[PDB]
Amino acid sequence: MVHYYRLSLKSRQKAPKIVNSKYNSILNIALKNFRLCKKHKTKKPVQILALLQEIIPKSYFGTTTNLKRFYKVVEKILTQSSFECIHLSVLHKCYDYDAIPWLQNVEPNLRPKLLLKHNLFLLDNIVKPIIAFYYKPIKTLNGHEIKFIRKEEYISFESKVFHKLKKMKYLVEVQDEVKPRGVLNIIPKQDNFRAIVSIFPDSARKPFFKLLTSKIYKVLEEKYKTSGSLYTCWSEFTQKTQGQIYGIKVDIRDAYGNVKIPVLCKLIQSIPTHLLDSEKKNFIVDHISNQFVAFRRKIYKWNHGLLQGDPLSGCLCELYMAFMDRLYFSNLDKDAFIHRTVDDYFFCSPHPHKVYDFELLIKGVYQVNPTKTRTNLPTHRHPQDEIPYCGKIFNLTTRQVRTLYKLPPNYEIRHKFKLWNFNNQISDDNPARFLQKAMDFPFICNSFTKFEFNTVFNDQRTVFANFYDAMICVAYKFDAAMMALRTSFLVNDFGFIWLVLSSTVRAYASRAFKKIVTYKGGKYRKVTFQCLKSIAWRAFLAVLKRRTEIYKGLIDRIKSREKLTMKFHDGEVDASYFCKLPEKFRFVKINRKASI
Numbered sequence: 001m002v003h004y005y006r007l008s009l010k011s012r013q014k015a016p017k018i019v020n021s022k023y024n025s026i027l028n029i030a031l032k033n034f035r036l037c038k039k040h041k042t043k044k045p046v047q048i049l050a051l052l053q054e055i056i057p058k059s060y061f062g063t064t065t066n067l068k069r070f071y072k073v074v075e076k077i078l079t080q081s082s083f084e085c086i087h088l089s090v091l092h093k094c095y096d097y098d099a100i101p102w103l104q105n106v107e108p109n110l111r112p113k114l115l116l117k118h119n120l121f122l123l124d125n126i127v128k129p130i131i132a133f134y135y136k137p138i139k140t141l142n143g144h145e146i147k148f149i150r151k152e153e154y155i156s157f158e159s160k161v162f163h164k165l166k167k168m169k170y171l172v173e174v175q176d177e178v179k180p181r182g183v184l185n186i187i188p189k190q191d192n193f194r195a196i197v198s199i200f201p202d203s204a205r206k207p208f209f210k211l212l213t214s215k216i217y218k219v220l221e222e223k224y225k226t227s228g229s230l231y232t233c234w235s236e237f238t239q240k241t242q243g244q245i246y247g248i249k250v251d252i253r254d255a256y257g258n259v260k261i262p263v264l265c266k267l268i269q270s271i272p273t274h275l276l277d278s279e280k281k282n283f284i285v286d287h288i289s290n291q292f293v294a295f296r297r298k299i300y301k302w303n304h305g306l307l308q309g310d311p312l313s314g315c316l317c318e319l320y321m322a323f324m325d326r327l328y329f330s331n332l333d334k335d336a337f338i339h340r341t342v343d344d345y346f347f348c349s350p351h352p353h354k355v356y357d358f359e360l361l362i363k364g365v366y367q368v369n370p371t372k373t374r375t376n377l378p379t380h381r382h383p384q385d386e387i388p389y390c391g392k393i394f395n396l397t398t399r400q401v402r403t404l405y406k407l408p409p410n411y412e413i414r415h416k417f418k419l420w421n422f423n424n425q426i427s428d429d430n431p432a433r434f435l436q437k438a439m440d441f442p443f444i445c446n447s448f449t450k451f452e453f454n455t456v457f458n459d460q461r462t463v464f465a466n467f468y469d470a471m472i473c474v475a476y477k478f479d480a481a482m483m484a485l486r487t488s489f490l491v492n493d494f495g496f497i498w499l500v501l502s503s504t505v506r507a508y509a510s511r512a513f514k515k516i517v518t519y520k521g522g523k524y525r526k527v528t529f530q531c532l533k534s535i536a537w538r539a540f541l542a543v544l545k546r547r548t549e550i551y552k553g554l555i556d557r558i559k560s561r562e563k564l565t566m567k568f569h570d571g572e573v574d575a576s577y578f579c580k581l582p583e584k585f586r587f588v589k590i591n592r593k594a595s596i
């Protein structure tokens, strides 16, 4: 039932010195070449697609046709998303078997499973290890992207950061023995770094910790200020305000590390026992006080605030944060707009002086990050009318709210979507199943909220723009799935494609239409199912036209079969935005080619 092979570098097994009885000892030469190459060349870059063709002899594959099929798989390993798989059937099917010599002196038909067994070995014992030996796969934390960084420069990076923590006081060696929480990792940021802990799966604890946070979140609601909602807050604020809105957003510098444990202990210790009894309180206290980590065989005590990556930090930073709110932010104008996430405050007022003071008040309490400050205060050099907050873009002048999309230059869009579920595998003979599991509505529901579909403060044209933007991401996933169908399922007829697509267009438009009517407001004029279906189809057109030489038949089908007249019962709506790929979506990569 195991149909999947993970491209991940944790599937790698250690290669033996020679080879046991089963394996054709033709690969043993390449295995010995692994230790020869590991014996330190070494120049930049020497491509991974070039090292392997020399270490593994060309006589393994036979012809230079089979070699082309195998090195596609190796190329997919070097461009992978997190949790990505291909089929095992890819590793043996459509190969020329007669050209392979070391398989000729063997059963003519028992070859598929033997070729597959040997291929597995090559990937697991040479390919992946020699990648992991030369490189370090790092999560950029932007979707499921994995950037490949040279192991050499990453360790010099790690020693530069490990230096600061050792030289400062943030990290102190314990010596020793006393059971670390997990392993310390130094992950890159923008120009900065990030110090988190990879937790040992000691579970146990997992459901225990899950119970602790559940009860600290019960304390926060019953005791501390019920801190808004964020649709209600903005909705009411815009309704009451008649003038020009002024607003500021501040990012707090390392919020977890700025928490004072002494203060936190007093708070955890302040809770009534019916909400949290002493036994759990006492435990949380010392658990917050005794943060132990391992880095390089040696164990360390972390004592700069809360450790990022611990199960409890999230809710306990939130406990501390809400206390800072009661103490310092309890006197804010009751006619102003106030909201805060974790380390993001968002203050808005018609009165520029009130916003100005909040900045001074906020800059006193916390050490804010000045680069990330977005505001339209006349005091600022380059004032922003639209500010990002909670995955939404708030415009202070128009009061319109749009979805924010985190898409950097030349980012391989396929990284946003997780197409492969290793716990729930789909075999290579059922692409239809795969395509529907991918078109499942949950992945885009976060873009299908009241914040986009209301006509309370959003104009009608804003609603359509939001739906179109959503549907653009759907088409990109659809595209991402098809590329996975072409090179893994190797599809027969593409008959189901039309049925799924039609269902997808028709389903999401009905979901939008439902949301629109529900969160209807005074700015509503008239929306129709016909209009939304049109928008939905055109959203697919714009993305499909990025691969005309593949979707020629599909585009032709849509244009001839579906209705596409861009007709709105509104006059302020520009129809040209709907017949083109939105600009934040142009510069994303659709092509895959082993970068490093």
Ligand SMILES: [Mg+2]
Binding pocket: 251, 252, 343, 344
């Ligand atoms: Mg933030």
